[PDB]
Design a protein around this ligand. Structure first.
Ligand SMILES: Nc1ccn([C@@H]2O[C@H](COP(=O)(O)O)[C@@H](O)[C@H]2O)c(=O)n1
Ligand SMILES: Nc1ccn([C@@H]2O[C@H](COP(=O)(O)O)[C@@H](O)[C@H]2O)c(=O)n1
Ligand SMILES: Nc1ccn([C@@H]2O[C@H](COP(=O)(O)O)[C@@H](O)[C@H]2O)c(=O)n1
Ligand SMILES: Nc1ccn([C@@H]2O[C@H](COP(=O)(O)O)[C@@H](O)[C@H]2O)c(=O)n1
Lengths: 135, 135, 135, 135
């Protein structure tokens, strides 16, 4: 059956919360993207690798604008939704847009992806106040 | 007779398809641009070079915004339209806009072009699904 | 009590006036931001350091867009408002937006901040005329 | 008397014409900007330098957005208007906006300007056709 690749909008990143970063290596060309804001650091089951539940696709959408496509298996998308700060946003088929700044890196690397991992990034000293004190 | 240089809009790049890249060398300054999405890799006839049917022009259009102009001969523009994913878009007289990120490279190189080639770039692992599964 | 982190909009920078720069060091990754336009260079009291009245927080707000959060104590926010060119803009709880160009630097450094100082930057030769001759 | 610094809009650059470039050196940090499209290369009178009729001012207008201010004397602004492609655009008091890409360079150099010159840049091979064939 047909399935929409749903956009992982910027709202899945909420300031003042810990976030997990999507690190991508290309050929020497890097890419670091705030993937999702979480309320607990992700742990892939003991000896299992990220490659099992998660596969990415870096593809051009214009003359200098690139997208990243995601294939997220049940076990990860259930873990990710439970760790997420914003209401369960992660779908099985997803994509996020790279801005013209980042897109250049992916194009200069001919969209070829060598390796990719998710890493837990901590929060700042004012973090506690940032989240609790909203407009 | 007068002739409009038609804009090669970003829609001629459709994600999940193989694409050919316009590689430009300047002086040491590079430029890599997704030129057109194709459904078969381009082959210039055996021993003939790209210089014969295709000549480019890098020109400024503002204070930090540059354009690239194209002169495409019959043989190439017929081949390109047949390989294209989107409905026959390529005209004899064309131009595409570089964003402020890329424009800087062309300006820093004083618009001088040393060499330029078209290269066939493959598709990702999720590629098959990307094209077939549209919004 | 609840408190809004008020945005330090770009209007607090008025051309033709001396400005103080927020210099941030990350890990080797730098950041230089025009913080506030002043009409007298700031001096932290003799032997006291900036760390006492001023603490920053670098946090992501999207997939490639970062914010900087400020905790400004009474003594500094009173000094800063008095030195400011624009009407007393500085609040106790503040934030300013980094553009996609700068945000990339903060993300590539994993939001980690090593050191940060405020520095007084002089005005140009036409400066006197710039401020006095407004549209 | 009061005088408006008039904006040198991007329209003073018309594609397919030779252009003169404003080259600025800072501290090691560079800046290359298409200044004005001309129909004849500029020549400063024999042994006279550009410093005599032309003085620039690099000033911040926001948190990551910079402007460049111009003081153009009679002799140069008369020469420049006569060489210009677009209708006499150059005024005595002028400014042009740097985009977020370029602004970063000026800020990282603390707005300090070491040297600046105007250089005549040639036109491409399709140049003749570009200008004559307009939309
Ligand atoms: N995501 C990023 C961020 C920065 N960069 C920078 O672009 C440069 C490209 O590599 P070269 O300098 O070897 O050409 C890297 O050295 C790196 O500093 C990158 O390649 N990918
Ligand atoms: N299209 C691109 C993309 C990146 N770059 C980067 O800009 C740098 C400019 O050269 P220098 O470092 O020698 O000044 C290159 O090393 C390269 O990494 C470029 O010149 N053109
Ligand atoms: N705010 C800024 C401005 C420029 N840069 C540049 O990005 C580069 C990143 O470091 P590497 O070249 O060592 O990867 C620095 O060398 C620096 O020239 C930066 O890291 N932060
Ligand atoms: N206008 C420009 C364009 C590029 N750059 C690049 O930014 C770099 C900044 O210098 P460092 O690498 O020495 O930090 C330069 O090497 C240069 O390649 C610049 O400084 N000004």
């Amino acid at each position: 059956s047909k399935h929409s690749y749903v956009e992982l909008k910027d709202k899945v990143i909420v300031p003042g919360w810990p976030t997990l970063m999507l690190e991508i290596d290309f050929v020497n060309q890097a890419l670091n993207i705030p993937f999702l804001s979480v309320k607990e650091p992700l742990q892939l089951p003991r000896e299992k690798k990220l490659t099992d539940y998660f596969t990415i696709d870096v593809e051009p959408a214009g003359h200098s604008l690139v997208n990243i496509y995601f294939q997220i298996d049940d076990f990860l998308l259930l873990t990710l939704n439970s760790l997420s700060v914003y209401k369960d946003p992660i779908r099985k088929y997803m994509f996020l847009r790279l801005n013209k700044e980042q897109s250049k890196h992916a194009i200069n690397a001919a969209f070829n992806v060598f390796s990719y991992r998710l890493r837990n990034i901590g929060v700042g000293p004012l973090g506690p106040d940032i989240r609790s004190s909203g407009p």
